[PDB]
Design a protein around this ligand. Structure first.
Ligand code: CL
Ligand code: CL
Ligand code: CL
Length: 226
């Protein structure tokens, strides 16, 4: 069995550095690359950085200076250099999937409470359709990102789930009702024959392997009309 688990989440005062850990089970860090993603309470997903299986690190432009990623044979660590109230979030470590900076294996996340460039436009912010109807989600990239785009599903209080990678390739266990289309600067997720079980927040991610390119869209809350 293959899984990932974060630990280290705590209440911290501003400026006091802390390190989160991510333990892996059923696979080796010498074979796989791991990345960190955070989510401020009730907000969107935000890509931090990645450590390759050979130890090469890349941070998203915003994250550079603010964090330090390190690894042992078993654990990947995330040090928050000088935490601020803006660093309050659920931190997830994720196993890299495929050829880009997308990921299929997520941990449940660990909570940090701090208390005393490519732009992805995702539309609409919220939408409901009838049962059996079709939902359409648009993602516009401010620069051409070719086919390096992933789609995720996140149910309230749950970890994100990979639906689609490479624009249109379905991840395992994903029903064909989910269709990814587009290329360049314009992308769509279509969810046909809508079910009450599809009610979740969906996110697009620029997966291109470059610090200035990797980014999540703001998300779309999808509901079903009763
Ligand atoms: Cl403290
Ligand atoms: Cl991808
Ligand atoms: Cl991001």
């Amino acid at each position: 069995a293959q899984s990932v688990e974060e630990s280290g989440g705590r209440l911290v005062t501003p400026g006091t550095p802390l390190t989160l850990a991510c333990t892996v089970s059923g696979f080796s860090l010498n074979t796989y690359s791991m990345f960190w993603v955070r989510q401020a309470p009730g907000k969107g997903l935000q890509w931090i950085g990645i450590i390759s299986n050979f130890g090469v690190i890349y941070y998203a432009t915003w994250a550079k200076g603010r964090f330090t990623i390190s690894k042992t044979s078993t654990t990947v660590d995330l040090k928050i250099t000088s935490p601020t109230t803006e660093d309050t979030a659920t931190y997830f470590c994720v196993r890299k999937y495929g050829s880009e900076w997308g990921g299929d294996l997520w941990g449940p996340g660990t909570l940090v409470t701090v208390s005393s460039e490519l732009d992805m436009t995702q539309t609409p912010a919220s939408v409901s359709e009838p049962v059996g109807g079709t939902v359409t989600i648009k993602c516009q990239a401010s620069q051409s990102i070719s086919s390096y785009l992933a789609w995720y599903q996140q149910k309230p209080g749950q970890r994100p789930r990979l639906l689609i990678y490479e624009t249109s390739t379905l991840a395992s266990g994903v029903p064909s009702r989910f269709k990814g289309s587009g290329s360049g600067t314009e992308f769509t997720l279509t969810i046909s024959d809508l079910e009450c079980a599809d009610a979740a927040t969906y996110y697009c991610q620029s997966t291109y392997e470059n610090p200035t390119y990797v980014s999540f869209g703001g998300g779309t809350e999808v509901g079903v009309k009763s």
